Design a binder for this molecule. Structure first.
Ligand SMILES: OC[C@H]1O[C@@H](O[C@H]2[C@H](O)[C@@H](O)[C@H](O)O[C@@H]2CO)[C@H](O)[C@@H](O)[C@@H]1O
Ligand SMILES: OC[C@H]1O[C@@H](O[C@H]2[C@H](O)[C@@H](O)[C@H](O)O[C@@H]2CO)[C@H](O)[C@@H](O)[C@@H]1O
Length: 179
């Protein structure tokens, strides 16, 4: 069993009573679904390609909704802590379990991402993806910021946390701030 989070009675994978999430990495160069780039143009701000930012699965992104622009959870931060687990054939165990904080700046839509982001309700409603996780975080890797962590799709526990000051200040430039 490479996945260390065990399903509960409802099928939701947990680790010592904390919910788990799956993770992947992505590179696409788009401004993204929280508007973190110049208005009207598909150009991200450089920090939104460089920093620890994420595209969560759609129903978390919009807190149960289906909006893919200025989702309800744009600008939230999440702390992801590796468990040591991974989905066999689709990841590996990381070299350490240091936790990393990421800011939500984009979305992973169900459409075209069914395996990982195809979750039909928000966290707390017992809906899971095809690997048993209630939420998925796709991690921006344009400049190798995830490669530098040596994260290959690790299984993590997840929690919402207050954003660090530099990420808060970055988010204030995004079009979806105060939308
Ligand atoms: O659909 C989510 C996300 O997947 C990323 O690809 C995964 C792939 O699904 C998995 O089989 C392999 O082990 O890992 C890669 C990298 O995490 C893809 O890069 C993203 O564009 C996509 O949003
Ligand atoms: O890039 C601006 C554009 O973002 C759209 O969200 C995309 C995002 O670009 C892409 O990186 C991610 O994989 O998928 C999301 C959702 O499709 C957003 O929906 C548009 O409104 C926006 O103009």
């Amino acid at each position: 069993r490479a996945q260390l989070c065990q399903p509960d009675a409802h099928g939701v994978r947990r680790f010592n009573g904390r919910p788990c999430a799956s993770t992947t990495r992505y590179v696409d160069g788009h401004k993204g679904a929280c508007g973190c780039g110049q208005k009207g143009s598909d150009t991200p701000f450089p920090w939104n390609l460089q920093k620890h930012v994420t595209a969560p699965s759609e129903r978390y992104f919009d807190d149960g909704g289906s909006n893919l622009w200025c989702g309800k959870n744009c600008g939230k931060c999440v702390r992801l802590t590796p468990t040591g687990g991974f989905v066999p054939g689709k990841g590996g165990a990381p070299p350490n379990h240091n936790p990393v904080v990421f800011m939500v700046t984009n979305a992973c839509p169900i459409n075209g991402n069914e395996e990982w982001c195809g979750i039909s309700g928000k966290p707390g409603t017992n809906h899971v993806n095809s690997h048993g996780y209630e939420v998925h975080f796709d991690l921006q890797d344009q400049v190798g910021q995830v490669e530098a962590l040596h994260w290959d799709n690790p299984e993590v526990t997840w929690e919402e946390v207050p954003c660090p000051g530099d990420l808060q200040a970055n988010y204030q430039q995004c079009e979806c701030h105060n939308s």
